[PDB]
Amino acid sequence: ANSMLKGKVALVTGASRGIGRAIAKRLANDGALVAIHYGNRKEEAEETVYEIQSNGGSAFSIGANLESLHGVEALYSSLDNELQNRTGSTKFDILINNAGIGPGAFIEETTEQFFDRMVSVNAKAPFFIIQQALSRLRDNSRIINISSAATRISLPDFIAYSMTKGAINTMTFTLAKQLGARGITVNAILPGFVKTDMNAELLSDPMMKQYATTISAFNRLGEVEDIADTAAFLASPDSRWVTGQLIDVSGGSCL
Amino acid sequence: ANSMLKGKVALVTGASRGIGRAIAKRLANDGALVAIHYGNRKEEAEETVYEIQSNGGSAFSIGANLESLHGVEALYSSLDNELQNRTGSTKFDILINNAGIGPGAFIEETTEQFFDRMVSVNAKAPFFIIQQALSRLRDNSRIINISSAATRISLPDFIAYSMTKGAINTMTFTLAKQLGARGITVNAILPGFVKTDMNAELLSDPMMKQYATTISAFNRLGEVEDIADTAAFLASPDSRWVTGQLIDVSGGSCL
Amino acid sequence: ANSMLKGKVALVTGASRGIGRAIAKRLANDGALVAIHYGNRKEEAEETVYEIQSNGGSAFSIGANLESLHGVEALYSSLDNELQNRTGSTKFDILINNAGIGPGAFIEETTEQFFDRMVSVNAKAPFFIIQQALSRLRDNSRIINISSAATRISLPDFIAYSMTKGAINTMTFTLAKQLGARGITVNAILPGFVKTDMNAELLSDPMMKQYATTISAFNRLGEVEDIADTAAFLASPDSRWVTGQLIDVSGGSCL
Amino acid sequence: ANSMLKGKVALVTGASRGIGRAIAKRLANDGALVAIHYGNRKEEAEETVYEIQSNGGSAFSIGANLESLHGVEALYSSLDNELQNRTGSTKFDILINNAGIGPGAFIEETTEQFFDRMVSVNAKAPFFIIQQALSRLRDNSRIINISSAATRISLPDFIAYSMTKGAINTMTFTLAKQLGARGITVNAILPGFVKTDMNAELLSDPMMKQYATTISAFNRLGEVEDIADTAAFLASPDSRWVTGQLIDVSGGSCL
Ligand SMILES: NC(=O)c1ccc[n+]([C@@H]2O[C@H](COP(=O)([O-])OP(=O)(O)OC[C@H]3O[C@@H](n4cnc5c(N)ncnc54)[C@H](OP(=O)(O)O)[C@@H]3O)[C@@H](O)[C@H]2O)c1
Ligand SMILES: NC(=O)c1ccc[n+]([C@@H]2O[C@H](COP(=O)([O-])OP(=O)(O)OC[C@H]3O[C@@H](n4cnc5c(N)ncnc54)[C@H](OP(=O)(O)O)[C@@H]3O)[C@@H](O)[C@H]2O)c1
Ligand SMILES: NC(=O)c1ccc[n+]([C@@H]2O[C@H](COP(=O)([O-])OP(=O)(O)OC[C@H]3O[C@@H](n4cnc5c(N)ncnc54)[C@H](OP(=O)(O)O)[C@@H]3O)[C@@H](O)[C@H]2O)c1
Ligand SMILES: NC(=O)c1ccc[n+]([C@@H]2O[C@H](COP(=O)([O-])OP(=O)(O)OC[C@H]3O[C@@H](n4cnc5c(N)ncnc54)[C@H](OP(=O)(O)O)[C@@H]3O)[C@@H](O)[C@H]2O)c1
Ligand SMILES: [Cl-]
């Protein structure tokens, strides 16, 4: 545990498991008060909180289903209540847009319903979460969006997913120019394959694993800690001169 | 006289005016049969048809409202009927996804309805237009998506628009890998500022004019023919070894 | 044969064989007077000329060893003499920087001598060829540099070669901004593997072939015509709004 | 207090002043033993050493003229001697290729000597510095190449300089694939305008100042610490999953 982020308040969406959980634990380890958002798995969120507290950090869990904007509004209603109680204001410093879905389909298999849901959760929700954060973020804050190396490496069997993450990349680079006036940086992290349960079944196939492992310059799968450790830098004061950037965190996958 | 596209059949979406109309004229000049799609009133499209025919070319118009997928269905029902009678086949060769909208709003001004409409028209429609095209495209066909230089140059005042075009960019590179098995290429053209009747209000302010003029390395506004002339290469057999590419056609804007 | 480039004069470096020969034949086919430069293989250059003339075009061969700037100076002394005789001036319209070398070495195997030679031929010579072309090129001319997809796809066994082509890419994008004032476009073509004798021995190994073939979205090796057909567009008036761009002509290799 | 680099050994080239000196101070602050290389007179480097030591850190200086490969040889002969006595080993952990020059010239002003010197100092030297480093670098080491935003933003008035930095960019991405087998990462930092005593003449013109200031999304000139603070992340164990990347550290210049 250290004090790099002492005095700072972070919201991490989708922090009940996987990458978001790792990110949340790393930020709390560095001294931040962390809001652990969950979509519906409350007890997993509570576990993330428990782990943070066990290691001397401060965190709390709040739910919101982000599949509609009424969910975004709910996120901020709860965040406001908890932060007001704990800190005397509804202000915060670090926003991690991590929550997302990623089911596969080729273009010929993609239905309207599937497409619309991918957009609602992965592109629309982060945009509206940022929109509502603007009144709450302090100057010199940090916005980090979790994208995907699928925006750099062609995966036609995930085409709708890739498109939503392409929208996130353009959103990042575009907003960075406006929000730099307030000192707020906006960056994206593009993970490669990372052992989590968005891909537990996909990676269960040994062919798929071999492909996933060997594409990295380091000949291993990524771990949640690999992503969290880069997010910690982007969340910190040290990264003040890096904005609008799409940082690959794939272990040099497909160089 | 160019006969590069003799025997070819092309569909250009949103081709009543502006860039779409110019692409339609150019493709027809090169020998293609051109379906000129329009979203509302036929009169503009019918006048383009008359102009093409007066210059010795072949074209017809088809109306469909692409604000919903029902319009995509109607587009293809009409196209199938027209092509079967005109050519003995429902198959075609060249798909130009030009149809789109581009109103402005900063993130803080962007409503849910505004955002959903941008996605529906600019990302969802081209996606399902391609989906339905695949059973009709011949091998060695060409798909050209009209994107925007706004995906390379930050325009916060058009943020939802930019996001939609970034989604198109990712779709373009992703699908190219899949469709190469059929010799089909998929590319995007990224225009900068182009003079139309439609853009001529944003372009009325002489300050904005000066910015848009001198951003180009050639120090002039783009013209619809500048775009159409690059689309002609991408639609031709000569571009066979170029796929998945985002081709800037901005007169070297902001290099 | 056509007249797209009627009245235009082109110089193609390294046109005695391979890609440069293909480019030269395509430009002459479109009506250009083509200067066929060769390093030392005069009879192969004469064959390129013979082939062009057989198909109704106009061309001539001139030698210059580009391994030193005295070679560049010699190139232009001969070009000036021949063009003055044939046209009444030393002006021209299209410059193709194609000539180059590409032997392999990992970083640990690269000597100072090897490195220096790669730079002299592949980076320095094209820069100085362009420098000397500036007094000779008309307004609205075209500069096309042949680079390599090795600038996008990591090939550590060709590291010095890749670095020289990276320098070419930056040179292209940078000069485009200055030369746009005269209407002159500057672009690069990045080929993938193409069956020529820069890689005849490398591809003779069936393992290397399989890799070279299957990385393309089209599951074939590139042909010299694939490169020439893209160069014809970049050389033409149709490409006036495309400048500073690095155009992949690899058949969607490694998307 | 940061102890991120405790036990680590770093070499920073051209670290008498400017960015190199700032990186050296920061790395030493984080616990690294720092070799501070200088190209001419020792006094600047020795003063940095004194400053680091006064703040509790460990460092020493080594002189070598990197305008030739003989200087690279001399660098490593001195470094081997120093490290063996200081640490019991010739091995080290962190290589920062910062040494370079950056005089301006348009293409039409660029002499052969000017061009050759730029290559020798900016591309050839870092290449052979890495070559000689590989036998000395431990597994899980870090190589960080200081490049330039001029590879993303066209500066025709620095064209040879830009070309040299594009060569460094390509080398960075290419080598990352090779070196991942040893857990070694290779990345580049691309600064924008940074305030030094060295840049302060180009920056004296208030017109140029205004351009360089407002090009950033943060509307201020870069500072040496802005660069050093990102280098600290790339030098650390936390950046293990980031390799082959060109990280813009320009305060979001020209987004
Ligand atoms: N793992 C990879 O290989 C990989 C690669 C590239 C990018 N990524 C990206 O990394 C991020 C996290 O991925 P992950 O692998 O850690 O995912 P994961 O293990 O599936 O966890 C997803 C998280 O998102 C939340 N979430 C999902 N749908 C939601 C909804 N509709 N409303 C609110 N919250 C919702 C979940 O909350 P509940 O627990 O309540 O369901 C959960 O905390 C995503 O943006 C993903 O695209 C992952
Ligand atoms: N103009 C520029 O500077 C610029 C720059 C970058 C990108 N672009 C892109 O280029 C494309 C067109 O450029 P433009 O400026 O020439 O277009 P435009 O002049 O604005 O005309 C738009 C065309 O798209 C059709 N359209 C719009 N919404 C539609 C809908 N909902 N359903 C069906 N059709 C619809 C219209 O058909 P109707 O005639 O029936 O309305 C019209 O012909 C767009 O994708 C645009 O984003 C333009
Ligand atoms: N083929 C590929 O797979 C591939 C892939 C990517 C990029 N490229 C690029 O495409 C371009 C042409 O390649 P290629 O495969 O066609 O090469 P090639 O078959 O080896 O032909 C090279 C040409 O360059 C000329 N040349 C070589 N060294 C020279 C020198 N020192 N001075 C003057 N001229 C010299 C040669 O003239 P002489 O005949 O007199 O020797 C010859 O005409 C090069 O820039 C290359 O890097 C090729
Ligand atoms: N400053 C900027 O705005 C900017 C922007 C983009 C990139 N960069 C890059 O960042 C690096 C340094 O930036 P800077 O402006 O802080 O540097 P600087 O202030 O110009 O100082 C240059 C340093 O490099 C060393 N050096 C120069 N030529 C050398 C040679 N031939 N042999 C050995 N050492 C040599 C010098 O050592 P001595 O003290 O012994 O001379 C000096 O410490 C360069 O690679 C530069 O291109 C800077
Ligand atoms: Cl987990």
Ligand SMILES: [Cl-]
């Ligand atoms: Cl707590």
Ligand SMILES: [Cl-]
């Ligand atoms: Cl118009």
Ligand SMILES: [Cl-]
């Ligand atoms: Cl009609």
Ligand SMILES: [Cl-]
């Ligand atoms: Cl040949």
Ligand SMILES: [Cl-]
């Ligand atoms: Cl002749």
Ligand SMILES: [Cl-]
């Ligand atoms: Cl300084």
Ligand SMILES: [Cl-]
């Ligand atoms: Cl010392």
